[PDB]
Structure formats: C-alpha cells, structure tokens
Amino acid sequence: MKEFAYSEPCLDKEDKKAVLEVLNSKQLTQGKRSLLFEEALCEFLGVKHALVFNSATSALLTLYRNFSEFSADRNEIITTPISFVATANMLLESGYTPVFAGIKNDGNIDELALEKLINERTKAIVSVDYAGKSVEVESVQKLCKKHSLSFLSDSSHALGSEYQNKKVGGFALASVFSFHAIKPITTAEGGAVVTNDSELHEKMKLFRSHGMLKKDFFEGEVKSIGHNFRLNEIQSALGLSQLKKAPFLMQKREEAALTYDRIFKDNPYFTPLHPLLKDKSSNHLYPILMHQKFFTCKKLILESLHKRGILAQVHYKPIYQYQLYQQLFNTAPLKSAEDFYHAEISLPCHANLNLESVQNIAHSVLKTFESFKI
C-alpha cells in the first residue's frame, strides 16, 4: 500500500502529555481549560470573545439561532452552494431559507454576484472561506452595512488564514471555526464561535449550556432554552496544545503546497489554486481544477488516483443538488458552482506530509492525468 488520506490529524508528545494531566484531574468538563482555550483563541485572532463547542455544526446552529431573533418576514439568508452541507443544514434548522449565490474560480462566494439576490426578506449573508482562502471581506462588509444585513462567516477551513495581513475571525459579526480531526488544528471533534459583540457572546454562551444562569451554589435560573454543546476539558487541553503550534502546522502545509506548485507548474491538465493566493492561507485543502475536457471521466480519474494510494476527495458537491434541497426548493443549477464541482479535486495536504511523499503524490497525479489521452 502506502495510502495518503486527504488530511489527517497531527498530534505530538506535547498534545498527549497535555491530555494526560487532564485525565488526572477531578475536573473533566466545565473547567478552567476551555476558558483558557477560549482566551488563547482571542489572542491568536485578536478578537474580543471566543466560545468553544462540541462541533462546528453546533457552533453554526448556535450562531444562526442567536445573532438575531427569528422573524418570518426576514427569513432569507444568502450563502454559497460550495461548502459542507452543515453550513446550510443549520440554516434550515434555524428557520432560514438558504439563497444560493454564484461562486468564483477560487471556490469562494462571488461578492460581485451578491447584491441582485437581496430583497426585503434577506436577513444575512453566510460566506465560507473555501480551502482557507479568505473571501472578499471588505466588499461583503460594505454590502451588508449598506443593506442592513448581518455578515456571518463560516471560517471552518480558515483558522490562521489572513486577509490584508489581518487574521480571519475578526471581520464578520461572528465567525465559526472547526477543530474536527482533519482541520487546521484538532480537538477530535470541536468548534468555536468568535465575535466582537458581547451581547451575542453572552446569548450564545447560555444557549451552549441549558440556558442556566447561576444564583448561589444551590440554584439556577432559566429564561430561555439551551443545549449541551460544551467542549470538555480533555479536548480543550488538546486544543490549547494544538493552537500553540498552529502557525507551525500551517507552515508545514504551506511548504507541502509550494512543492505541489513547483511540480504542477505549467502542466497541461489542471490548474492548482495555491499559486493564486494573495494572503496567507491555513491551507486546509490543496485543490486543483481540471480542464473542461476531463470532466466527463472524472470518476475514472478518482478511481485511478485511489488505486495509487492517493485517497483524493471532492469539495464540494453543490448543496442544492442534495435530494433534500431539490425537494424543498427546486433550485436552478448555477453554472459557476456546477463547473467548479466537476473540476475540483483536493489532494493530500496536512502537516505530516513530508517532502518525499508530496513529490511521489505530485508525480503520480500527473502520470494519472496523462494516461487519459485527450
């Protein structure tokens, strides 16, 4: 064999050490470490508040449910069809109707194609930093200010990524990050909502934990519902430990990407996105875009790659194509999204991928594409 998944977790002696001491403690959850992890996120991102969750999908639900109250008259939210289905499933769960915008070459939501989709039902815009590349923040901030819309950012891919030399996380009303096993850094399962809005932070904090407010050690008060989406102490210690070396892990991915770039440069088969970056990316993904000619035999290419141990993946199937979304709003397919979908392949890319591996992978990808003459 010799099989490379598209991403994998990268833990070290430190991470493990960090988890041990927690197991020695009487305080396994709702303890000092999640608070520490939250503060460390704040300093890393330069934002004013941070909340950690069991998953980013819980984070998303919490944000959608709490950034404003729900009004049946302001029930539309614009977002991208190119993202993990979770971005939209949580919109549904919060009563909102997703309105799918066109995307651009780089997989990011098309900021120029947003305004025509706004009507008096439009409440918010939910962008996704695809592969860790920050969307056109300045452009969207303004569109929303102009139309009194809330700017929400699913930045699951992008912890560490920058826009105009400023870290992603601060730009939206709130931003979501993910610490799933295979994201930039991990807590096995995990997520976070950061924001500069204290009131929002507070509402979310409660929603995350039963809506319980304290009085004394013996009694509480509940003025509104909440769940249990808390991140426990074991995972928080892991997160803290992972975050400390976040820039290091990002750079490893960056170097892997540069190696891909050297070898793919000017190839006749596909176009890699990484070279086109203007700001630092978390490099959560290393996507390549096939030329139109290869579309109709994509499946065979993926299988060919998999036969070489390159467990490639596609991000993402346009969300509106899922049976549930068809069922609910027969959504007209979007040329930009459909094209990107058929074209995109994410190659193996994570902090533990060494020089030798990248080169073997990069050459196998080329050998594969060329085998399918014209």
Ligand X SMILES: *Cc1c(COP(=O)(O)O)cnc(C)c1O
- Find the residue with minimal CB distance to ligand X: 56
Other CB atoms within 10 Å distance of the CB of residue 38: 21
Residue 297 binding a second copy, by CB under 8 A: no
Q: In whole angstroms, what is the distance from residue 352 CA to residue 361 CA?
A: 14
- Residue 240 makes CB contacts below 8 A (sequence gap 6+) with 18, 33, 36, 37, 40
Residue 211 binding a second copy, by CB under 8 A: yes
Q: What is the DSSP letter of 348?
A: P
- The SS3 of residue 151 is strand
Q: In whole angstroms, what is the distance from residue 266 CA to residue 295 CA?
A: 19
Q: Which of 191, 226, 272, 318 contacts ligand X by CB under 6 A?
A: 191
Please state the closest distance from residue 138 (CB atom) to a second copy, in A: 31
- The SS3 of residue 242 is helix
Considering only residues 55 to 74 of the shown chain, the ones binding ligand X according to CB under 6 A are: 55-57
Range in contact with a second copy (rule: CB under 8 A) among 25-33, 109-117, 130-138, 271-279: 25-33
Long-range contacts of 269-273 (CB under 8 A, 24+ apart): 269/294, 269/366, 269/369, 269/370, 270/294, 270/343, 270/345, 270/369, 273/105, 273/106, 273/107, 273/131, 273/133
Residue 128 binding ligand X, by CB under 6 A: yes
Residue 295 binding a second copy, by CB under 8 A: no
Which amino acid is located at 2 in the chain? K
Please state the closest distance from residue 268 (CB atom) to ligand X, in A: 31
- Residue 204 makes CB contacts below 8 A (sequence gap 6+) with 51, 62, 63, 66, 193, 195
- Residue 268 makes CB contacts below 8 A (sequence gap 6+) with none
Residue 35 binding a second copy, by CB under 8 A: no
Q: In whole angstroms, what is the distance from residue 322 CA to residue 331 CA?
A: 10
| Pair 174, 194: CB distance under 8 Å | yes
Residue 9 binding ligand X, by CB under 6 A: no
Residue 83 binding: pick among a second copy, ligand X, none (C-beta 5-8 Å cut-off by kind): ligand X
Considering only residues 278 to 337 of the shown chain, the ones binding ligand X according to CB under 6 A are: none
Residue 86 binding a second copy, by CB under 8 A: yes
Residue 369 binding a second copy, by CB under 8 A: no
Residue 76 binding: pick among a second copy, ligand X, none (C-beta 5-8 Å cut-off by kind): none
Q: Which of 157, 167, 252, 280 contacts ligand X by CB under 6 A?
A: 157
Residue 322 binding a second copy, by CB under 8 A: yes
Binding mask 22-61 for ligand X (x = CB under 6 A): ---------------------------------xxx----
Q: Footprint of a second copy on this chain (CB under 8 A)? A: 5, 8-9, 11, 15-16, 19-20, 23-24, 26-30, 54-58, 61, 85-86, 89-90, 92-93, 180-181, 186, 188-189, 210-212, 217-235, 299, 302, 306, 311, 313-314, 317, 322-325, 327
Q: Footprint of ligand X on this chain (CB under 6 A)? A: 55-57, 83-84, 86-87, 128, 154, 156-157, 178, 180, 191, 228
